[PDB]
Amino acid sequence: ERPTFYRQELNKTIWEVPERYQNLSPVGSGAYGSVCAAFDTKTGLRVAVKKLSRPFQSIIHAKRTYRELRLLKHMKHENVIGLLDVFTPARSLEEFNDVYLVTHLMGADLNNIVKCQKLTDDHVQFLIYQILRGLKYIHSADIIHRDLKPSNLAVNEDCELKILDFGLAVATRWYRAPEIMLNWMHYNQTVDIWSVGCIMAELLTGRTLFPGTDHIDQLKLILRLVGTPGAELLKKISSESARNYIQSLTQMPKMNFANVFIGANPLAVDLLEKMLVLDSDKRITAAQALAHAYFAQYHDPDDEPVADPYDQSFESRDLLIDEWKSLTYDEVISFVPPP
Ligand SMILES: Cc1ccc(-n2nc(C(C)(C)C)cc2NC(=O)Nc2cccc(Nc3ccnc4ccc(N)cc34)c2)cc1
Ligand SMILES: CCCCCCCCO[C@@H]1O[C@H](CO)[C@@H](O)[C@H](O)[C@H]1O
Ligand SMILES: CCCCCCCCO[C@@H]1O[C@H](CO)[C@@H](O)[C@H](O)[C@H]1O
């Protein structure tokens, strides 16, 4: 059963992997892990192999390692990264200290595409349809991505898109919902839709919607488009500290998106309006967006599946590193590759 491994140092790092993975070359690195591209001799596909750094060196790292394995083991959707393989050199729980994660290699990402060419509307539809299809699925398992941005969207020569998390340690803040920027301590799925909002806009116009140089600037850039909060929303913020200091900022009206996104498809503009509402309660959800008329060429409610129940209870446990490691060991041990 157990495969035979080989060994090589790549950059500063030891990479011990089953023979089937060949032609290893580094594609990026940092505090959360390193990745190599590689050829999977078993399938004939290019794959990405992620070695987690110091997976069990702290509690937080331990919980992070478990979190990522569990999440990735559960994801089974065309528009979301999937696990091809997870493996460890270790022969048992006691030797156990290294975790490798394997997925399809992604060609490249959506950020490249944006710069190197401008985009047709049919293309924009295709790209955004796929992101929301993926997000419907992720949101159905009560997972929030939280860091949707063009560099976490991998797209192939065929325009097939997968959502992932390229991060291994073009500001994230450019796509971040106004409430995250405010350290609102209980934010929800709609943060994701804000981000899709920022991406679509960018895909249509060619440039960053809100290219803020810091958190304060970011809110200024936003409020110039969506306008200062109104009373029905100020009523939702019962902090007197807040309300009175926002009202002391010179008012800013809501722009009409129709006068902003010039020469774009009316339907794109309407959808955007539904996504970039300041009040997260009023934003369109992923499920609802897939049905909007902008995606009539693509929509099919019989092919927009939801995720199987996903047990998240571990998130609210406070455990020992060896326990998180043991649990991660079980999940390695029980992995069944997809056909
Ligand atoms: C602590 C933690 C928890 C979860 C994650 N997530 N979350 C997700 C969602 C399902 C929510 C999109 C995905 C991840 N992790 C994830 O994508 N990990 C991962 C695993 C293996 C390889 C890669 N990176 C690459 C994948 C594909 N092609 C690449 C090409 C070049 C390159 N440098 C990296 C990759 C990312 C990441 C970290
Ligand atoms: C170009 C390099 C050729 C490498 C081919 C890798 C084939 C690995 O061989 C495989 O793995 C296991 C041991 O690793 C064996 O038990 C199996 O026979 C086989 O499934
Ligand atoms: C700088 C002015 C503040 C603009 C921030 C917009 C407020 C975000 O919107 C808020 O998101 C909260 C988080 O879940 C929800 O509890 C509220 O229902 C929603 O109104």
- Which amino acid, residue 215? H
Question: Nearest CA to 121 among 248, 9, 20, 263?
Answer: 263
> Distance between terminal CA atoms of the chain?
17
Using a 10 angstrom Cβ sphere, with 0-12 exposed, 13-18 middle and 19 or more buried, the burial of residue 289 is buried
306's CB contacts (< 8 A; 6+ apart) are: 136, 137, 140, 141
Pull the structure tokens for residue 113. Answer: 């595409």
Mapping DSSP onto H, E and C, the string for the chain reads CCCCEECCEECCEECCEECCEEEEEEEECCCCCEEEEEEECCCCEEEEEEECCCCCCCHHHHHHHHHHHHHHHHCCECCECCCCEEECCCCCCCCCCCCEEEEECCCEEHHHHHHHCCCCHHHHHHHHHHHHHHHHHHHHCCCCCCCCCHHHEEECCCCCEEECCCCCCCCHHHHCCCCHHHCCCCCCCCHHHHHHHHHHHHHHHCCCCCCCCCHHHHHHHHHHHHCCCCHHHHCCCCCHHHHHHHHCCCCCCCCCHHHCCCCCCHHHHHHHHHHCCCCHHHCCCHHHHHHCHHHCCCCCCCCCCCCCCCCCHHHHCCCCHHHHHHHHHHHHHCCCCCC
Active site residue 165: yes
- Which amino acid, residue 108? A
243 lines ligand 3 (CB under 6 A): no
Place of tokens 């997260």: 280
Domain boundaries, the chain: 15-107, 108-306
Place of tokens 């390193």: 34
Pairing label, strands 153-155, 161-163: antiparallel
Using a 10 angstrom Cβ sphere, with 0-12 exposed, 13-18 middle and 19 or more buried, the burial of residue 154 is buried
For residue 45, is it left (φ>0), alpha (ψ between -120 and 50) or beta? Answer: beta
- The residue nearest atom 24 of ligand 1, judged by CA position, is 166
Question: Nearest CA to 71 among 314, 338, 316, 325?
Answer: 314
**Are 109 and 27 in contact, with CB atoms under 8 Å apart?**
no
**Are 56 and 191 in contact, with CB atoms under 8 Å apart?**
no
Q: Which fold has domain 15-107?
A: Phosphorylase Kinase; domain 1 (3.30.200)
Site to probe by mutation for ligand 3, drawn from 224, 233, 235, 250 as the one with most ligand atoms within 8 Å of Cβ, is 233
Q: CA–CA distance from 197 to each of 78, 141, 269, 276 (Å)?
A: 21, 21, 10, 6
- Determine the Cα–Cα distance for residues 203 and 198; give it in Å rounded to an integer: 9
Question: Nearest CA to 32 among 67, 8, 82?
Answer: 67
- The residue nearest atom 21 of ligand 1, judged by CA position, is 50
**Are 216 and 261 in contact, with CB atoms under 8 Å apart?**
no
Site to probe by mutation for ligand 1, drawn from 164, 314, 324 as the one with most ligand atoms within 8 Å of Cβ, is 164
Place of tokens 């950020």: 111
Instruction: Please list, residue by residue across 41-75, b when 16 or more beta carbons sit within 10 angstroms of its beta carbon and e when fewer do.
Output: eeeeeebbbbbbbebbeeeebbbebbebbbbbbbb
For the beta carbon of residue 144, count every other beta carbon within 10 angstroms.
15
- Determine the Cα–Cα distance for residues 109 and 163; give it in Å rounded to an integer: 10
- Determine the Cα–Cα distance for residues 272 and 249; give it in Å rounded to an integer: 26
Q: Is residue 50 annotated as involved in ligand binding?
A: yes
Pull the structure tokens for residue 8. Answer: 């090589």
- Determine the Cα–Cα distance for residues 278 and 180; give it in Å rounded to an integer: 12
The CATH superfamily label for domain 108-306 reads Transferase(Phosphotransferase) domain 1 (1.10.510.10)
Q: CA–CA distance from 276 to each of 35, 76, 97, 162, 163 (Å)?
A: 34, 29, 44, 23, 20
Pull the structure tokens for residue 283. Answer: 């934003």
Handedness of CA 235, 237, 240, 244 (dihedral sign): negative
Place of tokens 């419907």: 136
Q: Is residue 49 annotated as involved in ligand binding?
A: no
Check if 15-107 and 108-306 are the same fold: no
188 lines ligand 3 (CB under 6 A): yes
**Using what technique was this structure determined?**
X-ray
Q: CA–CA distance from 70 to each of 1, 14, 77, 105, 338 (Å)?
A: 23, 24, 15, 20, 15
- Which amino acid, residue 276? L
